[PDB]
Amino acid sequence: ALNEGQIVTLAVDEIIETISAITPMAQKAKKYTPPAASMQRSSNTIWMPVEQE
Amino acid sequence: TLAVDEIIETISAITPMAQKAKKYTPPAASMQRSSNTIWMPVEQESPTQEGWDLTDKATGLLELNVAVNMGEPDNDFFQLRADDLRDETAYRRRIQSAARKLANNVELKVANMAAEMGSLVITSPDAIGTNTADAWNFVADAEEIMFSRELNRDMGTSYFFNPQDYKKAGYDLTKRDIFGRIPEEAYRDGTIQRQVAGFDDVLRSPKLPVLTKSTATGITVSGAQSFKPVAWQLDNDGNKVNVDNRFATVTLSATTGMKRGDKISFAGVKFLGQMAKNVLAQDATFSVVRVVDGTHVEITPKPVALDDVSLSPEQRAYANVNTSLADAMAVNILNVKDARTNVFWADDAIRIVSQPIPANHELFAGMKTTSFSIPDVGLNGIFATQGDISTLSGLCRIALWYGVNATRPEAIGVGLPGQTA
Amino acid sequence: ENRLESILSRFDADWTASDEARREAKNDLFFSRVSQWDDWLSQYT
Amino acid sequence: ADDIPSFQNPNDWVFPWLTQDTIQIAEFYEVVEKKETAFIYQDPVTGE
């Protein structure tokens, strides 16, 4: 034979997925969006009442 | 301090070589990974045999290649203070000058590579004004060496004179003591002619390099060295990697006084007829590309020897030289005196790869990037602006990413007049 | 080749292209329908 | 219905407390212009 042709390298962009994680608690937790940027690099929290007895 | 807006134009440049050079724009997405290199094959040459019974003498196939790559951007980064009236006044004309100087850089690079990687060398022991019709002798010598080596010239040919030798040729024409069409044109205008001695484009180029005389004396070859046309070779890991067909590393006695672009020839070694493999009467000429180590050089035509015995027949079918190196043969220089170079080439010998700079991406916020066509030459770059207040200024950058490549260094040539002493 | 990749590339290009006009339109809708004040960045105690 | 979808949501940070709505899905309409075959029949009543 001896075909001293021309050698290339082929990289195909069909990826091989490996990771698949499940997130069952963060979807269950309720999200709240405060309009208060004072929770910045500071210790200003928000105070909410507790059910009265 | 009265001042006007009429600008005194002072310089005007012409860039013919970058116009004649073909421009190549390969896909950037693939070039990002291929390491800014792309390979091209070389026209195949085949062996032949004689006789009836030729068992076990069947050959294989061997197709060589060359590689074309690119260097680094060429920029005009400058900074604009927003309060200086003399900076506010000159900004747009500075952009214009940036475009002009970028084009000038491109064509200067083309000229330098063509002069420093041209294998064909046409020397003369006297200047071009010495005898009559010796400018035509130069151009016809270039034509003849191309014809005899049987190089492809289908796209065209070009011969660039420097202004000195262009005027010498014009003087030769007007000293003819007659006036027809050629001498009358050379008198009324400086132009000798558009075609001379078979070249279909004879121009003058204001920025051809001056090739310094080499200091080399008495250099000989160390050991017999046979170079084999190969398309790939194994590396240390077993991977097959490609080989450029346009280089050969030669181990000499001492590479002192040898620099990039020097022209050499080995005693006894003769050219070949390429396709027909018939020896010529002219010594093979080579151009040293890189002086690696203190006893090695890299000459741009590979000296494949016809009489070589260690070559497979398909490899011998690529011979461009009658005999190999003989461990003692004298490599004699060809540029023995400083002289500006006239440069001839086939139009398909030099190309200009070009790439984009995607600075308009959404990654580069704050910057404003637009396209910027370089005039004269057919190239595109980026024009990027980013203001500043760490210095209360603004930064402007015109970038251009290209690379010249001599795909056929054996089709380029250099004319060296006055190579005496 | 991947259908998901092609569709998402088109949508990504479109979303990035129409970023500022959409932001201004949403701000105008909020201004005209909900409120004309912003307490978000007020560092005041 | 069990596999809840997710997509680029365009109502980011609805602000005061409960974000409420979630579950973004997209529908992608695409238009393909091409030459497809048509048949020339003969109407039994009149014409083609």
Cα–Cα distances (Å) from B349 to B65, B283, B290, D47, in that order, read 15, 22, 20, 67
Q: Which pair of structure tokens corresponds to residue B76?
A: 């005009």
CA-CA distance, A18 to B150, in Å (whole number)?
58
Contacts of B99 (CB under 8 A, 6+ apart): B372, B374, B375, B398
Query: For residue C16, with 0-12 CB atoms within 10 Å meaning exposed, 13-18 middle and 19 or more buried, which class applies?
Result: exposed
Q: Cβ–Cβ of D26/C15 closer than 8 Å? A: no
- 3-class SS of residue B185: helix
> Residue type for A33, please?
T
Does residue A6 sit at the B interface (CB-CB below 8 Å)? yes
Q: Which residue has the tokens 């027909």?
A: B276
Min distance A20 CA to chain C CA atoms (Å): 17
Q: Please report, in angstroms and rounded to a whole number, the separation of the first and last CA atoms in chain C.
A: 56
B298 burial level (CB within 10 Å; 0-12, 13-18, 19+): middle
Q: How far apart are CA B405 and CA B289, in angstroms?
A: 13
As a whole number of angstroms, the distance between CA B158 and CA B342 comes to 11
Report which of B135, B122, B155, B140 is spatially closest to residue B198, judged by C-alpha positions.
B140
Alpha-carbon distance B380 to B352, whole Å? 12
Contacting partners of chain D (3+ CB pairs under 8 A): A, C
Q: Do B63 and A6 touch (CB under 8 A)?
A: yes
Burial (CB count within 10 angstroms: exposed 0-12, middle 13-18, buried 19+), residue A36: middle
CA distances from B150 to B147, B275, B343 (A): 5, 7, 19
Instruction: State the Cα–Cα distance between residues B12 and B51, nearest whole angstrom.
Output: 66
**Contacting residues of D for A27, CB less than 8 Å apart:** 4
Can you read off the two tokens belonging to residue B181? 């069409």
Structure-token pair, residue B4: 């006007």
Contact A7 B230 (CB under 8 A): no
Name D48's bridge partners: none
Does any CB of chain A come closer than 8 Å to the CB of residue B313?
A: no
Rounded to a whole number, what is the distance in Å from the CA of A13 to chain D's nearest CA?
24
Q: Name the 3-class secondary structure at B62.
A: strand
Instruction: Tell me if B165 sits within 8 A of B136, measured CB to CB.
Output: no
Residue type (1 letter), D19: T
Token code pair at residue B117: 């990687």
The phi, psi pair for B23, rounded to 5°, reads -115, 135
Token pair for B336: 């023995």
Residues of C in contact with D10 (CB under 8 A): 22
Reduced to 3 states, what is the DSSP secondary structure of residue B106? helix
Q: Is B63 on the interface with A (CB under 8 A)?
A: yes
**In contact, B408 and B348? CB cutoff 8 Å:** yes
Place of tokens 């007007």: B174
The whole-angstrom distance between A1's CA and the closest CA on chain B is 6
**For residues B65 and B41, is the Cβ–Cβ distance under 8 A?**
yes
Half-sphere exposure of B27 (CA within 13 A, CB side): 4
Angle, helices C19-33/C3-17, rounded to nearest 10 degrees:
60
User: Which of C4, C11, C12 to probe by mutation at the D interface, max D CB count within 10 Å?
Assistant: C11
State how far the alpha carbon of B287 is from the alpha carbons of B56, B89, B409, in Å. 39, 49, 9
> In the PDB record, what is the listed experimental method?
cryo-EM
What are the tokens at B167?
């005027």
Separation in Å, CA B214 to CA B256, B285, B293, B303: 9, 15, 18, 22
Handedness of CA B272, B275, B276, B277 (dihedral sign): positive
Q: Chain B contacts of A1, Cβ < 8 Å? A: 60
What is the rounded CA–CA span in Å between residue B344 and residue B328?
33
Backbone angles phi, psi at A13, to 5 degrees: -95, 35
Q: Do A4 and B63 touch (CB under 8 A)?
A: yes
Contact A14 C39 (CB under 8 A): no
Of the candidates A3, A6, A11, which has its C-beta nearest B242's C-beta? A6
Do B231 and A1 lie within an 8 Å CB cutoff? no
C25 backbone dihedrals φ, ψ, rounded to 5° = -65, -45
Neighbours of B173 (CB within 10 A): 22
| Contact status, residue B95 vs residue B374, Cβ threshold 8 Å | no
CB contacts, 8 Å: D26 with chain C? 11
Other chains touching A, judged by 3 or more CB pairs under 8 Å: B, C, D
8 A C-beta contact, residue B396 and residue B103: no
Contact B119, B301 (CB under 8 A): yes
- The verdict on B61 touching A (C-beta cutoff 8 Å) is yes
Q: Do B61 and A5 touch (CB under 8 A)?
A: yes
Question: What angle do helix axes B134-149 and B163-174 make, rounded to 10 degrees?
Answer: 120
Closest CA to B204 of B342, B77, B99, B97: B342
| Nearest CA-CA partner of B225 in B208, B260, B250 | B250
Q: Is A10 on the interface with B (CB under 8 A)?
A: no
| Resolution rounded to one decimal, in angstroms | 3.1
Q: Partners of B234 in the beta sheet?
A: B240
Alpha-carbon distance A46 to B356, whole Å? 52
Beta partners for B161? B204
| Rounded Cα–Cα distance for residues B173 and B189 (Å) | 12
Backbone CA torsion sign across A48, A50, A51, A53: negative
- Please, which chains are in contact with C (at least 3 CB pairs closer than 8 A)? A, D
